[PDB]
Amino acid sequence: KVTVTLVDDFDGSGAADETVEFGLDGVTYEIDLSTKNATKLRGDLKQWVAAGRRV
Amino acid sequence: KVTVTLVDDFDGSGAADETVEFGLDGVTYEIDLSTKNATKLRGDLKQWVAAGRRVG
């Protein structure tokens, strides 16, 4: 049978739960992640977003 | 005398050497940083940029 799977781009393992959008140096990215991993990515950006300012 | 200086936003006690643009969840951000802290920022996103896909 044909199986279509949404795979977590970061640890390569499982049913990814969400796609997160993010950016650096004017480049925009998208990434498919488990709930756990998207929490991890937002966690890594937390301190820079706080110190930074919205444009 | 008056002094005008770019101060590192992250720790607040240093001359910023550069301004870095980044984004999360549709929102775009700017931050002024020392060369060192700019390296830390880019370092924190490195694994995520690597696994992610560039879009418009």
Residue numbers in the entry:
A (entry chain A): 4 to 58
B (entry chain B): 4 to 59
What does the paper say about this structure?
The dimer forms a 4-stranded anti-parallel β-sheet such that the helices are arranged in an antiparallel fashion and are on the same side of the β-sheet.
These crystals contained protein truncated at Lys-4 as a result of limited proteolysis using trypsin. We then artificially induced this proteolytic processing by adding low concentrations of trypsin to purified N-Lsr2 before crystallization. This facilitated crystallization in a different space group, P3121. The dimerization and the linear oligomerization of N-Lsr2 is identical in this hexagonal space group when compared to the structure in the P21 crystals. The linear oligomer strands lie side-by-side in the monoclinic (P21) crystals whereas the hexagonal crystals (P3121) are made up of stacked layers of linear strands that are rotated by 120 degrees. This provides further evidence that the tendency to form linear chains of dimers by processing of the N-terminus is intrinsic and not a crystallographic artifact. The hexagonal crystals have a higher solvent content (70.0%) when compared to the monoclinic crystals (38.7%) and there are pores running through the crystal lattice.
